[PDB]
With several copies, the nearest count.
Chain A
Amino acid sequence: AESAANTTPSSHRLETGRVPALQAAETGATSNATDENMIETRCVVNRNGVLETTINHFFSRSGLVGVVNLTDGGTDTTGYATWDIDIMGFVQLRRKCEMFTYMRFNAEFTFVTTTKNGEARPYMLQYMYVPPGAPKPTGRDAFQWQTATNPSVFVKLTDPPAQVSVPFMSPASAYQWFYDGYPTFGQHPETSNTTYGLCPNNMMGTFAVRVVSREASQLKLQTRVYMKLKHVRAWVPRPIRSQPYLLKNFPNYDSSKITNSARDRSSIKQAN
């Protein structure tokens, strides 16, 4: 259907037996009472489109995902800057994605790198994706930066932002943002269940970045990750969270200081 719905011409009824406005809500179903079984309507040929409300047009937005700092000092230097790939770091795309239970999609990661004061000097960077199980690079001159049997992107700061496409690589058939279980067997404590809700089917490796040079470069870069979902399929729709987020991998909320879903009114017998 390319349009929403057309309206049939209706009229009045004067007869017993037909009750379309007495739909019982105790059955768990939604009231199917239309306008034609009610106040007299007319013939309207609606041609309003429904294409924008689809899932592929709703999840085709990039949004901010990760912010990675790279100081590259001279005396307190590290060289590299890894970033665990997770979507729960910023509450916008998290709120947009946690309204479903199971999802399956592809990615269009984009990397925007700027300096501290803001300046595009021609410094070439190396963006490395470390899959889960591969060793992480330790140092700006490590052995792992050879990128043999490992995908990496070489780009400068004066160049346009890099953009790669990422397939679906979870060992399960779909992702999940809510895991009602435990990752392994054993006795689970009563004090602090810090492993509850953890899903090993979402650890998508680690993302590292360094500056390709010989000695050093006294510059503090700041990379931003923009992930565009595509080819997305969602299952089991879940309600939208009404409480402020507190942690990344845990949906914890405030016991006291609760936020009501609707703001307060003057009286119940007042519309304004």
Chain B
Amino acid sequence: SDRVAQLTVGNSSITTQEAANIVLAYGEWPEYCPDTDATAVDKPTRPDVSVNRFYTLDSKMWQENSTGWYWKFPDVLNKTGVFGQNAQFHYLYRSGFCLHVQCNASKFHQGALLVAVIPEFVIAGRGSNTKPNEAPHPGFTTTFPGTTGATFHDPYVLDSGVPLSQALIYPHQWINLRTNNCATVIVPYINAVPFDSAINHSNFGLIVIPVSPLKYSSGATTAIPITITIAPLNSEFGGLRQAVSQ
């Protein structure tokens, strides 16, 4: 009665057979903005059925020489559906997120994945140049990968100069192929400002890094996809104006 769970948000449902306990980030539930902490005067809109649902991204084939992938979460759902449309028309934004990462295999495969969230996950340029005009900086497709995603070049340093070993302080979960096949994290709104633009500022970002490499004997299946589903819980929007893309 602990390994099974059915999460229902809107008109979507996620059933599970091999699950650990759900993770609540920092022990705080995602709620609406109170009147004491708010600062805008205009009334925010709350669809609560059209943007609060499970959106499924693409799947990535977990190979043997894989490094890892990452995402900017207020920027992945920036163009997909009613949530993206409602976020392009508005200037302010505040919501939490519910995550679910699917990765199933047989009882003859071995491996482990580290899925965690990092608030203000800043991508660092890679180089040994200190001159201001040639210092390497990541492009826009590297900082904000969109709905597709981006890969790691040096996943041992999280592409930011911070070691992967010490990244266990964040809200994290493991996907051990002998124990479970999914990981679930519920993260609230974490920012130093009440509302913020969901276009030029990503609050946090998911990262999936295979710590133990994928191994199997010759004869089993070779395509191991990595699927991710996200539910924008308790969404609020303010400052209605023209729709901008980026």
Touch between chains A and B, by CB atoms below 8 Å? yes
Query: What is the total number of residues of chain B having a CB less than 8 Å from a CB of chain A?
Result: 67
A240 in the interface (beta carbon within 8 A): yes
Q: Please report whether the interface of chain B is mostly helix, strand, loop or mixed according to DSSP.
A: loop
Q: How far is the CA of A242 from the CA of B205 in the complex (A)?
A: 21
- Least Cβ distance of A101 to chain B in Å? 5
Contact A246 B172 (CB under 8 A): no
Determine which of B72, B140, B190, B199 lies in contact with A193 in the assembled complex, contact meaning CB atoms within 8 Å: B140
Q: With A35-B41, A190-B139 known to touch, is A26 a contact of B180 (CB < 8 Å)?
A: yes
Interface membership of B46, Cβ < 8 A: no
Q: Please name all residues of chain A whose beta carbon is closer than 8 Å to the beta carbon of B180 when the two chains form the complex.
A: 26
Taking CB atoms, residues of chain B closer than 8 Å to A43 are: 35
User: Are the CB atoms of A182 and B200 closer together than 8 Å?
Assistant: yes
A240 to B162 alpha-carbon distance, docked (Å) = 6
| Cα of A258 to Cα of B156 in the assembled complex, Å | 10
Segment touching A, from B5-13, B82-90, B130-138: B130-138
A191 within 8 A of B: yes
A258 interface neighbour in B138, B157, B176, B199, Cβ under 8 Å = B157
- B81 to chain A minimum Cβ distance, whole angstroms, is 22
Q: How far is the CB of B160 from chain A (nearest CB, A)?
A: 6
| 21 residue pairs bridging A and B, Cβ less than 8 Å apart | A7-B41, A26-B174, A26-B180, A28-B23, A42-B35, A101-B120, A176-B120, A180-B201, A180-B204, A181-B200, A190-B139, A193-B137, A236-B190, A237-B169, A238-B169, A242-B166, A243-B162, A251-B122, A252-B125, A253-B124, A255-B153
User: A26-B180, A27-B20, A173-B193 provided; 18 other pairs, C-beta below 8 A?
Assistant: A26-B179, A27-B21, A41-B42, A42-B35, A101-B119, A175-B192, A179-B122, A182-B200, A191-B139, A235-B192, A238-B162, A239-B166, A242-B161, A243-B161, A247-B130, A250-B125, A252-B136, A261-B163
* A interface, CB within 8 angstroms of B: 7, 24-29, 35, 39-45, 101-102, 172-176, 178-185, 187-194, 196-197, 201, 235-243, 246-247, 250-258, 261
Query: 9 tightest A-B contacts by CB?
Result: A181-B201, A239-B166, A255-B126, A243-B161, A178-B120, A253-B161, A190-B139, A28-B173, A182-B200
